[PDB]
Design a protein around this nucleic acid. Structure first.
Ligand code: ZN
Lengths: 327, 74, 121, 53
RNA sequence: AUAAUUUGACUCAA
RNA sequence: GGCUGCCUGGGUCCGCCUUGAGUGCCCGGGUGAGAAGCAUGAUCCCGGGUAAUUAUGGCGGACCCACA
């Protein structure tokens, strides 16, 4: 019923008395409407028709942005949730490309099989699988091993099956659906699909169609009210929830922003479950994303000792004039 | 030779579906119990522990091999 | 009832609107299909717009009502979409239909035009 | 298109009526969109009245 | 520039 | 030694490491119907559209060397 992105960690306290200063830095609430676009991700409801790549370009032109991205490729016929990275927050996609996914799938069957046997086979497709990406793919054609979390059966109408399904990133629905059809005998293809979840992105009120997107944009552009366009885009910290976070002090911010690696004497709070090699998000105390990087220690080693390098800072997003120098 | 298991059914697309426990490779020889040629492996799929195997039949009658035990020639 | 419907349609009047298209088909000329209908509006060619009450999603026809008050054209809603098509003379459904040439339905059309005035303001 | 959704509970189905709560069901697939969006000006005017602008 | 990745791309030429 | 300014390894941000034309598909404009799918666009013509990120080598530039 759940994903590795669902598993909620817990904030651990290495320092309780390290406090935040409200005058430096800008949180998601107190970002100017221009700034929110630079460091913003759109939770988009993608209509079917175009490729995800074409979707990018339209947003690029209509809102007049010079760089944009997406959290994976969804097919023309396919619809649903799509994370949309903007401007500075374009690179945040690297965290959403490997993250867990979930789709709602309809599957036509070419023959007749009594109802109860289907679920028995539908139960059986829970675990690791072997697939080869089809001729129509963006990755190399090699036999990898992808993970399947759960397939809950929605409803059936004889030859058609409605079902909810969540998988690891890169897993092919059409390849699976075809293979389940061969597991029942008569074969199967996919006539329709929609995404429902992608990492920490699901069908909520922050989800938005392209229609409403552009509508709200011109309501601030022509008419000039900020409230509506604000909830259209999300602070880039939304694309971070499913990742281990580290809360750093006011003095540990400015140094890191200048490219510096995070030391242990700079940590105040941290998520539990960290290993060496995992990507960890670096946060201020007001919950603003500073940078991304690989861990040099475990949740124990950062907590116990007072000397050493904890996080290898790799990708900087926060500007330098936000928090002044304190090293 | 090594054993796979019992044959499930013949798909209309051109595949004999067998239920096996081990991981084979691309283009394997398939023979029955008496060392006579049946077909060649084209597609492997399904779960990790017990994967299904689809076979390309290079024989005249793949309709009589329903409810049979197929192997891999070694 | 959906949000693009700005006013209530008495059940007799909707039938009268269907009576228009049905007869219009043979004596005059008509525009069947949302895309066509809209084209018929902006070119000012239209004389009456007939939208269905059961259109999904809302966005496909939404633009019509404000575009009708733009180019002065009176417009009307009808219950079914499946019923709109059959009255327009096709297998499947039509969401919105517009009449160019009233044909014999002249008076029937002109009467609908006056009863939509009061239901507006 | 055939995949529908309830505008009340959040259930996907194939029928016209919600086989669960009993509401009218509508199509899940979002409205088709153009990079030109021809009549966008007019669609905004309808959205103004409903939202109250 | 080379090699990967994201469920969608393949053929060619200076 | 502390500091400025020229100097340069590492880290970090920004640029660049081909562009034409053709297939598939999409979208607009024009047109408006007997497989039945489809008026929420059949057909036919014309126009336009086809993203990103990581790792390493090369190159032009912007900051800084920081256990807080
Ligand atoms: Zn319901």
């Amino acid at each position: 019923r759940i994903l590795p992105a669902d598993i909620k960690r817990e904030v651990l306290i290495k320092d309780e008395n390290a406090e935040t200063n409200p005058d430096w830095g800008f949180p998601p609430e107190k970002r100017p409407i221009e700034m929110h676009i630079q460091f913003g991700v759109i939770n988009l409801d993608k209509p079917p028709g175009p490729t995800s790549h074409e979707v990018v370009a339209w947003i690029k032109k209509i809102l007049n942005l010079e760089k944009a991205g997406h959290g994976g490729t969804l097919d023309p016929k396919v619809s649903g949730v799509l994370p949309v990275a903007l401007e500075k927050a374009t690179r945040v996609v690297q965290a959403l490309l490997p993250a867990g996914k979930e789709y709602v799938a309809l599957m036509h069957l070419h023959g007749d099989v009594p109802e109860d046997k289907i679920i028995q086979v539908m139960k059986e497709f829970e675990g690791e699988i072997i697939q080869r990406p089809p001729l129509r793919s963006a990755v190399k054609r090699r036999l990898r091993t992808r993970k399947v979390y759960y397939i809950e059966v929605l409803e059936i109408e004889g030859r058609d099956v409605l079902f909810r399904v969540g998988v690891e990133a890169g897993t092919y629905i059409r390849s699976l659906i075809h293979h389940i059809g061969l597991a029942l005998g008569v074969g199967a293809h996919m006539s329709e699909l929609r995404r429902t979840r992608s990492g920490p992105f699901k069908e909520d009120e922050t989800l938005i169609t392209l229609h409403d997107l552009v509508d709200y944009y011109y309501f601030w552009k022509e008419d000039g009210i900020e409230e509506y366009f604000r909830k259209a885009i999300q602070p880039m910290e939304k694309a971070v929830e499913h990742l281990p976070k580290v809360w750093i002090k006011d003095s540990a911010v400015a140094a890191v922003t200048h490219g510096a690696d995070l030391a242990v004497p700079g940590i105040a709070k941290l998520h539990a479950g960290i290993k060496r090699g995992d990507l960890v998000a670096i946060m201020t105390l007001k919950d603003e994303l500073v940078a991304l990087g690989k861990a040099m220690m475990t949740s124990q080693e950062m907590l116990e000792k007072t000397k050493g390098i904890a996080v290898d800072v790799e990708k900087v997003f926060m500007p330098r004039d936000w928090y002044p120098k304190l090293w | 030779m090594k054993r796979l298991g019992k044959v499930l059914h013949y798909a209309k697309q051109g595949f004999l579906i067998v239920r096996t426990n081990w991981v084979p490779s691309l283009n394997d020889r398939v023979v029955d119990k008496r060392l006579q040629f049946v077909g060649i492996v084209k597609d492997v799929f399904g779960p990790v522990k017990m994967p299904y195997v689809a076979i390309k039949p290079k024989v005249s009658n793949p309709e009589i091999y329903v409810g049979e035990v197929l192997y891999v020639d070694e | 009832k959906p949000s693009y419907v700005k006013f209530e349609v008495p059940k007799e009047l909707a039938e009268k609107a269907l009576q228009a298209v049905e007869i219009a088909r043979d004596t005059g000329k008509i525009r069947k299909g949302t895309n066509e209908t809209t084209k018929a509006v902006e070119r000012g060619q239209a004389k009456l717009v007939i939208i269905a009450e059961d259109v999904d999603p809302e966005e496909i026809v939404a633009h019509l009502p404000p575009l009708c008050e733009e180019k002065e054209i009176p417009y009307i809603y009808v219950p079914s979409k499946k019923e709109l098509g059959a009255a327009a003379g096709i297998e499947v459904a039509a969401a919105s239909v517009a009449i160019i040439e009233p044909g014999k339905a002249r008076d029937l059309v002109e009467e609908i035009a006056m009863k939509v005035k009061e239901l507006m303001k | 298109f055939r995949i529908r959704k309830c505008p009340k509970c959040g259930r996907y189905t194939l029928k016209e009526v919600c086989p669960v709560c009993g509401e009218k069901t509508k199509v899940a697939h979002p409205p088709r969109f153009s990079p030109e969006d021809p009549y966008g000006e007019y669609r905004r005017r309808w959205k103004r009245e409903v939202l109250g602008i």
